[PDB]
Amino acid sequence: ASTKKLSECLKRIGDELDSN
Amino acid sequence: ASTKKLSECLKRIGDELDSN
Amino acid sequence: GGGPTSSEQIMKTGALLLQGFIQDRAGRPVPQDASTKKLSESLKRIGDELDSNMELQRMIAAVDTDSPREVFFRVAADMFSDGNFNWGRVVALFYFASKLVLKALSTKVPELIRTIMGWTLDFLRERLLGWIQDQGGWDGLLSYFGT
Amino acid sequence: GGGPTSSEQIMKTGALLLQGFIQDRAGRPVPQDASTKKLSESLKRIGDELDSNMELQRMIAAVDTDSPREVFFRVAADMFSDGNFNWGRVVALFYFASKLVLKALSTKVPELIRTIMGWTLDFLRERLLGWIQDQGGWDGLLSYFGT
The CATH number of residue C2's host domain is 1.10.437.10
Contact in structure between D25 and D19 (CB atoms under 8 Å): no
- CA C46 to chain CA mean position, Å: 17
User: B20 in contact with D at a CB cutoff of 8 Å?
Assistant: no
Q: Distance between CA C147 and CA D38 in Å, rounded?
A: 8
Question: Is chain B touching chain D, with at least 3 CB–CB pairs below 8 Å?
Answer: yes
Q: Which residues of D touch B18 (CB under 8 A)?
A: 86-88
Q: Which residues of C touch D133 (CB under 8 A)?
A: 5, 7, 10
Q: Distance between CA B17 and CA D38 in Å, rounded?
A: 18
Q: Distance between CA C118 and CA C57 in Å, rounded?
A: 33
Contact in structure between B10 and D89 (CB atoms under 8 Å): yes
Alpha-carbon distances of D31 from C38, C107, D1, D36, rounded to whole Å: 48, 21, 20, 10
* Number of helices followed by number of strands (H, E) in chain A: 1, 0
Q: Give buried/exposed letters for D101-117 (b at 16+ CB in 10 A, else e).
A: bebbbeeebeebbeebb
CB pairs under 8 A between C and D: 198
Contact in structure between C36 and A7 (CB atoms under 8 Å): no
When divided into structural domains, chain C yields a total of: 1
Resolution value (Å, 1 decimal) = 2.5
Q: Distance between CA D138 and CA C98 in Å, rounded?
A: 19
Q: Distance between CA D146 and CA D143 in Å, rounded?
A: 5
Alpha-carbon distances of D100 from A10, C10, D41, D103, rounded to whole Å: 36, 40, 21, 5
Q: Which of residues 18-47 of D touch B (CB under 8 A)?
A: 46
Q: Which amino acid makes up residue D117?
A: M
Q: Distance between CA D55 and CA C41 in Å, rounded?
A: 35
Q: Distance between CA C142 and CA D113 in Å, rounded?
A: 44
Q: Distance between CA C112 and CA C117 in Å, rounded?
A: 8
**Substitution target from A5, A11, A12, A18 for chain C, most C beta carbons within 10 A:** A11
Nearest beta carbon to residue B2 from set D46, D62, D87: D62
Determination approach: X-ray
Report the candidate in C105, C89, C103 with the shortest Cα–Cα distance to residue C46. Answer: C89
User: D92 in contact with B at a CB cutoff of 8 Å?
Assistant: yes
Contact in structure between D124 and C21 (CB atoms under 8 Å): no
Q: Distance between CA C75 and CA C81 in Å, rounded?
A: 10
Nearest beta carbon to residue D75 from set B7, B15, B18: B7
Burial label for C1, CB within 10 Å (0-12, 13-18, 19+), is: exposed
Residues with Cβ within 8 Å of residue A18, at least 6 apart in sequence: C86, C87, C88, D144
Q: Distance between CA D126 and CA D118 in Å, rounded?
A: 12
Q: Give buried/exposed letters for D6-19 (b at 16+ CB in 10 A, else e).
A: eeebbebbbebbbb
Neighbours of A20 (CB within 10 A): 8
Q: Distance between CA D3 and CA C64 in Å, rounded?
A: 43
Contact in structure between D100 and D129 (CB atoms under 8 Å): no
Residue B2: left if φ>0, alpha if ψ -120 to 50, beta else—which one? Answer: alpha
Written in H, E and C, the secondary structure of D20-52 is HHHHHHHHCCCCCCHHHHHHHHHHHHHHHHHHH
Contact in structure between D16 and D32 (CB atoms under 8 Å): yes
Contact in structure between B7 and D78 (CB atoms under 8 Å): yes
Neighbours of A18 (CB within 10 A): 12
Give residue C125's domain range.
1-147
